[PDB]
Every structure is written in structure tokens, then in C-alpha cells.
Design a protein around this nucleic acid. Structure first.
Length: 271
RNA sequence: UAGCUAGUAGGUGGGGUAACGGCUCACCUAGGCGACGAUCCCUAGCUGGUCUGAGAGGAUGACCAGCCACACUGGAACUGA
RNA sequence: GCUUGAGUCUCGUAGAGGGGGGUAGAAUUCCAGGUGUAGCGGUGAAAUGCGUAGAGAUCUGGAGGAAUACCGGUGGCGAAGGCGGCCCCCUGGACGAAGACUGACGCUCAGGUGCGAAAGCGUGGGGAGCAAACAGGAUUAGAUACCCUGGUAGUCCACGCCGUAAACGAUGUCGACUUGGAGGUUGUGCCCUUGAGGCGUGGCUUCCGGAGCUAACGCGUUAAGUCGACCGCCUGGGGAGUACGGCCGCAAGGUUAAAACUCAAAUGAAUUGACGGGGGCCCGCACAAGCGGUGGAGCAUGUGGUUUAAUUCGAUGCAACGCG
RNA sequence: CGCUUACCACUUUGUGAUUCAUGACUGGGGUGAAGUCGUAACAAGGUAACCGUAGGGGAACCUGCGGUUGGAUCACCUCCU
RNA sequence: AGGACCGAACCGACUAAUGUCGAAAAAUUAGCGGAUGACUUGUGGCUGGGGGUGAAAGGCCAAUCAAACCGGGAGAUAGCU
RNA sequence: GCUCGCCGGAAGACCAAGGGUUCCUGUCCAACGUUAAUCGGGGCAGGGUGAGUCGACCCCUAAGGCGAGGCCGAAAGGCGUAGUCGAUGGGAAACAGGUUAAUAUUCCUGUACUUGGUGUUACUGCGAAGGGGGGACGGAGAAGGCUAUGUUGGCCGGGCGACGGUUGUCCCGGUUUAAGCGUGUAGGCUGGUUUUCCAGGCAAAUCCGGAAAAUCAAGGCUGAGGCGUGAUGACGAGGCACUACGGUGCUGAAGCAACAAAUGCCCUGCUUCCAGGAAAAGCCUCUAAGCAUCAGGUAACAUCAAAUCGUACCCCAAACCGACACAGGUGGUCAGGUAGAGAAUACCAAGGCGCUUGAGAGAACUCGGGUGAAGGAACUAGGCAAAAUGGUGCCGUAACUUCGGGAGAAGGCACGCUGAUAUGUAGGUGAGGUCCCUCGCGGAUGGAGCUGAAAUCAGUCGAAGAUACCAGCUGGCUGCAACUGUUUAUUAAAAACACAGCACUGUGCAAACACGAAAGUGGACGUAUACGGUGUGACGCCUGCCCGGUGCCGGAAGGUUAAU
RNA sequence: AAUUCCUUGUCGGGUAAGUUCCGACCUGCACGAAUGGCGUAAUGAUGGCCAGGCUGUCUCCACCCGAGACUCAGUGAAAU
RNA sequence: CUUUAAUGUUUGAUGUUCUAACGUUGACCCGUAAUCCGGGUUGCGGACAGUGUCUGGUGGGUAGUUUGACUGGGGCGGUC
RNA sequence: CGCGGGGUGGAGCAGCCUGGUAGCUCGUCGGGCUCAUAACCCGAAGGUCGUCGGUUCAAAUCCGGCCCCCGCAACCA
RNA sequence: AGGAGGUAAAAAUGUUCA
């Protein structure tokens, strides 16, 4: 649901919490947890490559099965857990032979529903099967790119890809950006949109809300001296320069897509 | 102008006034008034009557007289039937 | 106590009454593929725009959202707003038939409570078509309009909020009584259904009109007719349905509701005309059908204007200008 | 008698309510000599008007949505026995 | 529940005086701010000189910063003292 | 040695870090100490640090480092797999008392305990760098049960006292006791058990997971503390006894009860919210390749072993860091009495100190403070500074508002002590007696004792009852920024930065972007409800006109046009 | 006006007296709509103004208590 | 000469297809208990992408530097 | 510097590839349409076709060569 | 009689009294 907090204190006034009481309030499933040390946006050289990242609360990586290669084995969803690594929810699904795994939670999924993988599965939210078996025009998610790589597209909350058309081995996909990209037909895909579609409407309210989220303070360009940023300088809010990045690269209108090897799959660019 | 009152609604004992009485205290009860208009504000002395109008009413309350109220302003009290 | 008031029970009747859940078809837009070529699109004309990067046209297939062609009817249901492809499920009210039953339980109603077109707002989805604002193209004296190309909010959905409308037959609700004809819609009874039926008894409604009423227009058995019961509202026009305060509302505002001042009209109906890019019929060198000319040239002449000591005055759309 | 206890008016202090005048300036309105730009309603008012509402605009108004009539005109050309 | 309130430890450092060859190469004294959080802190790591880091002052990087320090070019150059 | 004064959530008592003999004794006074100095953190000599249980080493990992081959790079070198190091983290085991000039959970007495080796006896299947469980974990808040500790009483010992009283409801002192073992409690967690079967656990599996039946309802696990034992032991006030006069020797009563009660423990709990909360080994358990008259494993018992290094002293400071015997800084543990909400504060206990120049004087002037006639901001750049307000309970409280606030708004009343209500109430805790019981640390019942608010009335004392320390000045108008927060360490704390929110724009994953010659990493084990950049900066009403210049996006026909 | 030069603009309020302050007028040297405009409860060791209280801030200082200053004894600098 | 039509031919290009170069930050196996890496099957791309040499353009991201003198001080103007 | 391109009423600009025609609009005079104004509808001054030499029956055009604007790339006294 | 398909681009103001 959408909880709108009461302004009993400034900074709590605008906060909008999103509760999902179907979530498992207990502890996570131990056999699928591994350490996830934070980086701080620093590479091997130690230099901070990406800024505004670091600090925040400690979390643990939950191994989510994106591959979904359990062909011919039914599975029943036990419960819905909270995965801090995503923007969506994950479900601890149990197989008939006793194997437990974590899969991305689709929209219409409850604690106790039946799913399965392979080209046998009926078109029902949760089931995975190659796109050469999936009806043209249906709504899917967690789409693979290389037949067996794992699943790349549509992985955020309430995000889905719509299988537009099929030309032999190629499948036209209207992505979330409004960009149509062709993909090999032997790629696995999962039916149904990703759940927790209300993750977007959540507001943070507090400045420190983003601080434990992981984000650090971002300083604007016109608040620094010229040696630090191309905008900088000034004796009182002067700009007179064309909007750039901290490295002279033009921003606010400048396509920097330099691929050329993947242009062969793009039908329509983002519009 | 929609809730108003807290000796305020009542009873009991004492007291007190020429006399009944919260008139006034002590104690107990928690009600009393209120849309058939309380409280709040503004306004004005009431009437017998008068001017007018066919009646019904409207306006008004100077002159005479009856009743109430005041005595520069506010409070208290005496004398005396 | 009774029963003609009112209500309940049994069997049925018709239906866009309402709520929720699935689904179908045509059309429109977008997309993938094949085919194929200089226009397409649009208009009063035209252009922006779309297109030789190959659209539009055409065929096959897919995805979506909204509304439900014909049946459809001044036909039906509902208190009103309003509501229709199809089916399921839950549910409301009215109506008819034959009897019984309670025995005035009735009607209205300031306050109060609820619903309540569209527009709008909040939260989150959806977003084809359409479409404020806006960009562009025409047009125009200007066009921040009518017109054309696109297009955001909105239009749709779920939960709350708003509570306004020419929310209007501009006609409150209830009951009694009061000549009829022409249709629609829906029960029931009797008779030979002896043939697309005939005669009555009820609910709903449309049209034309008598008595009567009304200022008139017209209403007229569903009344503005004749009476009785309850409630609301009005007191010349503007100021003003605005100000101040309260109350409700997130906001936009809504509701309740003045004074000063100012004017002597404001307003309705109907009547005689005139006008109209209203209409019908008819008429004239009005047009159309042709001929001969004016305007350009010189001249004769009139007039305005200019000039002048004065260049008399009058006429000065058609109806002044070879006129006095 | 004095002292004193209680009641006690005038009066002082802090904070509310309501109401009467005044107040630089300002919104809108009414009245008033034949101003100015546009021409908005009145016929079908040359985009029918108007009611509600949202948005826009020097100004009347313009625009969408829905609703009402307190809006007009339905005569002439191609097919059929 | 709270980047919630008051207020020690703790962290910070707004005002004034003192001090200024000081007790101290920014402290003391009396008061101040935060004080369940974007908090504070110990121990151990990582990022480096035209580079690091920076809730961004051109602040900080060992009492040194508009480009650290150590050594080397180098006895730089100095029309100046 | 006797008074006196200060700290007492430190100026006390102990560890780590860091120092490095500063520790103890004798002796010495030149230098050192801001003075003298027979004194000393100074000079000289000698003595002193004792561990299977403490820590480190050790076993195992984190951040991160190195890194066989490898990949990459002019060389150096960088990155990195397997591995291997790396604590501030996880993992076995001891407490009390005595004792020295100086050391002690280390030595001595008493009483235990843990992990391995060897051997014997009785049984039995054991066995990997492999699998599973466990280890193993977040913030906040509330409640209950105890303990450390404290107070009172009883009891025991002593005294009855240099100025009035004091054999009494009197006064001072003490009333201390662990680890281990047994019990298994308050309370908390989970349904056990048996059989069959399986695409799961890189192979196997009886261990884990899963799917069906049966039987019965409890069993198992965890667990502070209490009570017994440890302990007719130690310790113990005070006597008894000789003194190098410092202390040693000897002996030795009570040693219980009641209440209050932690921030300690149960709690690595329970509830709730969300930002969703290390890894590995030790331990337990099932097996593979194999190994079985073996070997090993479980259990009992005997014996042996448990090494090496540190250990002194300082540790909120004259011993560390500040050049100093420096008014500065320095993590963690314990933390009593009275009043009080409290770790504030005030005065004290334990304990430690009087800060290493003093003696006189009492001037101006300076610093740190006390008080003030009348006035009350007239001072001044400005109410700077001082002054004043200051507590609990109750009453009462506006404009405005995001309806939470504003607000402790402002402004008022009562506060001490004594007695009564009541030989201390409400409340709290709670033995004995009694009853029952699946019998224990049980449940009800029962109520002595102990402890103890607050409220009301009456009386009384002073000028003043929150009397000290402690402890808001308030109200009105307004600019800026929303608010918490951050910053110029050492002249600027703000209106500057950040901020949640909003918008544009980039990015389809070998993503954009960034560090890097490169590989490779970060972005992200994320994937458009995501991530980067830039601007603005809650929230409300909004956000107009201009595409010429510049950048950017898109379309290339044409002109010009590099290398070739 | 954190912006207005001319200027202490002009009017009204506050004071006996107001170059500051508060409410307006527009003559905007040279505001202006995300280098955001305009409002805004709360918050602020913030800027400006006022009133009450309060006081040695001041009128105008006075006295007193301590640490120095002064004298004696020991030690014994520095800038120049 | 202008303008056009068919063929051959000369080049620049474009379109499509193919697999062997090359790519592979897809799956599977081995080296090996090892997500680096190498090799082997296979799939998808595919003469692209990427890299070297030359070259046009862009470029304050970065670097080295210039930025006159006289002057009744300097700056402005003016002058040489 | 050498390949291009472009010059014509008082300003804006087709005829230029096709040699035979100096035009299309708004501004200043009037005139028509109205009841009058406005709007609208039309005719009307005026350009050495940059100048100059010259192939042709005839020149803005195709041709030449030079002054003069604007477009990138060229320039080491 | 009973019912259908198709049919009009542009043209504003009126200086006031009587």
C-alpha cells in the first residue's frame, strides 16, 4: 500500500512509505546468501571512478536464479522476501525435488502458486520458456540476450517487455525505453510484468534517507572553483558557458552512443 | 448570536428579612434552561391612550393621569411606620 | 373495532434500474513481412506536414484502448442526475391476477443524512481515437477566431473530494373530483382462435382539443381546471447573487447572505411594420443570350477643386454633373 | 473608641472579545457632454445563443466537455410502375 | 515512530574578556550548538603531486598548499639590491 | 605525628596503545628540578618481571596486500586465478586466600578444569581439498525475573564518655565467602516419532531438503539466578604478645533476616519498523576414491605433555603525543553514602593529594568577583557585557497553520517543618499457618513484618520555604534560507554548500561515464520504476516573449574540400 | 528591494526628535518568472527595528574581597 | 555543342548471401576441488567491429607562451 | 592565392539552363465597388540589366577580361 | 401515396441631437 506519514516532525512531513504486508517479516534463506562488500565507487587503482556513491547500510547478496533452466520440474512459491539489491521483490520458490531458489517476483504472484520452466509451460505469469513458443504480442520480462546468458532486459519493479513480432530467428521487442531491438528467438523469457509496481511512487523525504540508501551528496558545477569544474568560477552566480560534464563532454543534448557493432539489432532508437 | 449556568437546578440543617425564598452559608445529589428562541448584541421608559385607517392594522407613547426607575458618578448604611 | 387509506404474503410480467466478473465483432492507430510507385494528405483555393530514406494504396498476422453499427422507436427502466453488443452472478423498484391478513401502521417536513451530468482536483494506473493550452500553416485592416497539420492536461479505470448546471415538461409532494378522439407500450378477463381477431377492466406515456383557468401565449383527466394538507421561495432595476463573518473544501471556490449609493425604469406577452448571408411563387434589358458603346485619344460642354479684385447663386448617391 | 476579620466601590496590571470613528494607498462599482480600439449579444448576428465549468487572451470574448431551446431553414437536382 | 524536545558524558566552536617575547606556535574562563543520528570513536587498510579528496573554502594532503616534502638538474636566471 | 583544606563519573582504582628500567633498596648533591634540598622520575651500585587456564604466537577468515603459471605493458612494472598472509572479529580450559622493599587469575595452601599423545580392556565399521547443520550477527522500544551493591533491624564485640544530658526507641565497628559440581527453575524456541519413495545437494549418502501414510500427544533444546556442596576451611573486629620501635608471631565471637535495586546479567531474548542487518574454521554429522584377522572411532581407566615470547612501572599523565617536570590532547573497564530525575550538582567514604619559589605590604594601575543611594539604555556602531528569568504540580494560553504545531506562548496559585486522617494511607514485596497436587525451585489461600508516595485539614517559624549549588528572559513587526545537517583545522558558521522534490538530457548492456599507455576494474554481480551528467532546491500558485548569434539534434542535394 | 545612482525621494505610522525600521506610491539609473518569480507554518549560536522586564552599560563612579604590581631573600630571560 | 538510348568496358560505390579471417565480457568439457587464462566441440555475429599507418575536422580536456612604449603616479584618450 | 557562385526600379527579386518579353509586390497621384469611410480590385513615373571589348539578323541571358560584396580551405619575407 | 444519397468560399463600423 501507499503510506503517507504524519508530519509529527519536519523531515517526516513529505515521506511516503510503501508497505507490502505480504512480505516475509522473518529472516532470509541462509543457503543462498553470500557476502556483498561495498565499493564506494572505487576501482582497482583506488581512484573514485563514479562519484556520489558510498556509505549507507550494509546488505547481503541473495543469489537470484536469472537463468531459470529447470526444465520439466514444477515449482511452488513459498513466500516473498525483501531483496535490498533490487527495486523489486524476490520469491523463495521450492521445486518438487527439493531444490530452493530465488526468482524475480512477477506481478500476479501469491504465496502458494505453481510455476515451472521449459517449452512445456502454459502461458501463465511466472513460467519461463523460449520466445519461439511464446505468443506474439504477450507481455514478458527478464529477457535473455544470448541463448543461455541469464536474462538482461526488464528487471526493475513493474517493468516489462512486449514481444512485438517474429521473423524466423529474430524477435522484435518493444523495450521499456520505447526502443525496438531484435533478439534471437531461442532466448528464455519470463511471462508477466515484474511485481512491486509501486516502488516508483515512493519518496524519501529526508536528506539522510538517501545517505543510508547509499547515495552521497552531489555538488553542482557552479559551486566550485574553475580548477575543479568547467562551470566553476564567478563572483556570484555567473554561468555563460555551455553545459558540460566535469570532463568537458557536452551534456544536455549530445548523443554519445559509440557502438557500431550492435546497430544491426536496433530497429528504432529511443523516442 | 447555538449551546448557556457552577450558589448556578433541588433538597437538608442553621441563619436571616416585616414575610415566602439560594436571600445567604455548610453538606450531598448532577442536573436546570434551550429551536413554541435560551444566552449575546443593539434599541427603548410601560400602559390607559393618541395620529391615522372602513374594519383588520401601521405609527407612536409630547400634553393629563396611573405604574416603574433616577437624582453630578459609583458604593454602603442610618433614622424613621 | 371495521374498511373504501396504507402495508405484507403466494404465482407471474416487461425492462439501456444498479454493482462486479469474463467475452465477441467491425472500425481506428501503431508495428513486422511481402507486393509496388510518384505522389499522398488537405482545402473555398492553398500551405505546413507525410514521401524517392521508398509513404500512401493493398494483403496476411499481431498488439492495444474506447465506444458498442443495424434491431433503436416523442419505445423502456429509474427519485433525479442518468442508463443500452453478448453472457454469468448478486441485488432494487414498479405493475397485473385471484384471495387472505394487520387494522390508520398515513402524508409532509425547517434542522439533519445520502446520492447526485459534465467540467475540475488528489493518489496510482492506462493512453488508440479525440482534444483545451500550445507550436506551425492559411486568412485577415489585426486573427493571440472561424479553417487545416500535429498535440499536453483531460477524455477511460480504482479509491476519496467537489457539489456546481438552460440540474428545464423553466411547472414541489400527496390525495379527491372533472366531456372525448387519435397512437405507442405493458398485464388480465370473457367470447367462436371459428381468419393479420371482437368487447371491457388496470399501470405508463405521446399528440390534438371542450369546460374552466390564464395577461397572453397556451395548459387541459400525466393540468397552469375545481378543493383540501405539509414544505420551499419572491417583494421595483442596478449595486449583487457581490462585500464582511461563519461553515464546507487540498485548491479552484461553493453555500448562507447585506449596506451605502444610484435609477424610474427594469420584465413578460401579444399587435402593426421594417430587417435578415430565412424560405416559397412571380415580375422588369435584373441576369442570361447577342449587338452597339463608355473608360484610353482630340474636341464641345457641365461640375468639383485651384486660382482670382469677382471668377454670382442653386442643384451636389440612384433621384448633381448638355440640370435652372 | 481603638485594633482586627469578612464583604467592598474608585483604581492599577496581563491577556481576550466585540463594536464605533479615523487612516497613506488600493480592488471593484454607480453616475456623468456627441472620446478610443475592437464589434460581443439582437435575423441562422455572418462561428447559433446561452447555462456550468476548466484554460487562454488589450477589450468585448475565444476554446474543450456536457446540457437546454429562451435557434433558423428543410424548396430544388440523379434512380423506381 | 521521530535527521522529535530539554539536558551531562562525547563532538563542535557563536559571543566577550584574558592571553599576544602566552600555561599553550588558536588555549583558558563564563556562557553557547548537536547530543538515536547525514552521530561519534578505537584499531587496521585504500586513494598522491598537475595527482588525491573535497555536504565545494580554491579548504585539506604530517604546525608547509592557486599545486606537499626530500634529493638531483644547479653554482638555474636576476638589464635588480 | 596532630590539626587544616581540595578531588571524589576524579586529581580514585585497573588494562590496551605508546614509552623502555622511569619500578624497589642503600648511597651521593656539582650538573638536572625555574628557589633551598640530607628529597626525587637526577648521578653510582645492587635487586626485581616465575603462567597448560591472561595476552600474543597458534587454528580460521574480513577490508586489503602479495601473488606459481596467466594476461598486459618500451624496461621498470601493472592486473590478477590457484593459493598465501592479514584483527579491531570467530575458536578449548581457574577462582578464593596468603605473601614481598618491589612480582602474582603466574609463586605457596586449598579446590578444580580443557585439549592432545601413548598404552590396556570391552565393543563397533572407519575414512577427504566433497555435502548439510551450526557458528551467525540490524536499529529502536517495553515488560518481567535476578545480581552487583546499598539501607535498616536482629545478633556479636566494645563504650556509657575531659561543658548541660546519655543503661537507652543509645552510640561506633563487623556481620565477608569464588570457580567447579548437583538440581534444571523464572522465562524463551520448536509438534515429536516410525515407514516407504525421489529429476535436489559439481559423484555418492542412512545427514540435509521434498512428497505421501501411521501413532501419540508431548518430547527435545536453551537457560540468568536461587538453593545444597565447595566451607567443623579461609577471612574476620578486637585481644593476647615482643619491639631493630618498621611490624611479626599467636588466637579469635557474630557471620542471618528484610526491603530497595542497576546503564550488569537472562537477552547471541520478545514485540515492532525498516534503511533488511560480516566470512571462514573449531564442533556435530553423512559419505566418495578406497581401507577391514587391520587401521581408526565411541566409552572407561592409568600415565605423560601442554613449549616459546610479554609480565617490573607509567596509562585522563612531571614517564604517551605537545622541543619543557607544558593550564592542551589520549580508546576501554569498575564506579559507594545523603539530597536529587540523573553519570548534573552540593558535601563526604574508599583512596589520593595541597598543583616545586616563599616571606612582608595592602599605592596608582591591571586581571577575577561581591554590593549600591536616585535614575533606568540617557552608554554604544549595536542593550557588547553584566543583570535578570530559571523547578515540579495544577489552572490558563492568541495571530497564524502544512491542522503536527505555534506552546513551557504570555500570565497566575500552592511549595519548609510538626501532628492528625493513618502507634506511616494508597501502592509494592511478602514468611508462617492451611489445602491440594501429574510432587517441586509447584499452584492457590493466607496475611505478620519490612518499605513507602502523594493528597487534605489544623498548627507553627522566618523578611524570604523550587531558600544553597543547580536552573529558559519574554512579546510584536520583518529580510534571507525551508527545516536536521556541512564549511574556510589557525581572523569569515552565513544569506554559502547539502537537502528531499522537480526538469532536461544521456545510456539497450562488451551501456553511457571514469581510472588506466594496456589488460582489467568501478558503474553492478545493477539492467530504463536502472544508472550518469547538469540545473533548480520542501510545500502552495505558477513558470510568459524570442531560434537571429553559440552549442546541440536531424536531413544531405549542391559548392568548396585531406590523404590516396 | 541584500537591487533605487540622483536621495536622507514622497506620504502615513512609530519617538519630543528616526539617513535605520514598518505599510504604500511607481520617477524599475540598472527586478523578473528553474542562473527561477511570488508567497509560506515551523526552524535559525543569522541580518534590521520596537516594547516590557532588568541591571554600574551610562549619568558619576564609591567601597570591599582575592591574584599581580611594591619591598626583602634565591634563580634569572628577551625583543633592541 | 545540347540532350538522351542500347551495349561493352572502366571505377567508386550500395544490396544480398556465404564461411574459413577475425570477435565472442553465451553454453558445455578438460587442464583443476579454481568465476583469471589457454585449448577443444558448439551457437550467434561476420569480412563488419576493433587495432596499426597516413589524413581532414573538432578540441582551454591539457601544455608552452605572448599580451608595446612614452605618460608631469597609474588607468582612459592621444601619439610613434 | 585558385575553384565556385551572385550583381537589374527608391529597397526587396523572376526571367539566366531555352538567346527574341525588362516583369512581379509594397510604399506616393487618381479612379472604380458603398448610402459614405475602410478593405479590396487596377492602371500609372522609373532600372547605363556593374563597366567595358565583342562572336549574332537582334543582347540581361551564352562569351572575355577586370573593379566590388561572401563562402569555406590555402600564406614561414 | 410511404421512405432515402446529394446541394450555398468571402462582405466590418456606423461621429451625435431631432
Amino acid at each position: 500500500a501507499v503510506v503517507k506519514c504524519k508530519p509529527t516532525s519536519p523531515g517526516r512531513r513529505h515521506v511516503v512509505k510503501v508497505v507490502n504486508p505480504e512480505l516475509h517479516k522473518g529472516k532470509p534463506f541462509a543457503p543462498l546468501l553470500e557476502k556483498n562488500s561495498k565499493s564506494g565507487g572505487r576501482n582497482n587503482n583506488g581512484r573514485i571512478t563514479t562519484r556520489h556513491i558510498g556509505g549507507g547500510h550494509k546488505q547481503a547478496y541473495r543469489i537470484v536464479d536469472f537463468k531459470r533452466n529447470k526444465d520439466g520440474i514444477p515449482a511452488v512459491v513459498e513466500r516473498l522476501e525483501y531483496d535490498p539489491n533490487r527495486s523489486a521483490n524476490i520469491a523463495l520458490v521450492l521445486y518438487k525435488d527439493g531444490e530452493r531458489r530465488y526468482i524475480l517476483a512477477p506481478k500476479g504472484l501469491k504465496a502458494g502458486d505453481q510455476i515451472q520452466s521449459g517449452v512445456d509451460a502454459a502461458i501463465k505469469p511466472g513460467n519461463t520458456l523460449p520466445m519461439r513458443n511464446i505468443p506474439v504480442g504477450s507481455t514478458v520480462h527478464n529477457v535473455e540476450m544470448k541463448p543461455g546468458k541469464g536474462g538482461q532486459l526488464a528487471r526493475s519493479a513493474g517493468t516489462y517487455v512486449q514481444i512485438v513480432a517474429r521473423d524466423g530467428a529474430y524477435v522484435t521487442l518493444r523495450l521499456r525505453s520505447g526502443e525496438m531491438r531484435k533478439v534471437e528467438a531461442d532466448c528464455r523469457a519470463t511471462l508477466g510484468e515484474v511485481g512491486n509496481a509501486e516502488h516508483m511512487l515512493r519518496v524519501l523525504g529526508k536528506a539522510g534517507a538517501a545517505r543510508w540508501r547509499g547515495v552521497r551528496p552531489t555538488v553542482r558545477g557552479t559551486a566550485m572553483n574553475p580548477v575543479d569544474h568547467p562551470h566553476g568560477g564567478g563572483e556570484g552566480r555567473n554561468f555563460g558557458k555551455h553545459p558540460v560534464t566535469p570532463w568537458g563532454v557536452q551534456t544536455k543534448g549530445k548523443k554519445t552512443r559509440s557502438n557500431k557493432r550492435t546497430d544491426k539489432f536496433i530497429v528504432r532508437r529511443r523516442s
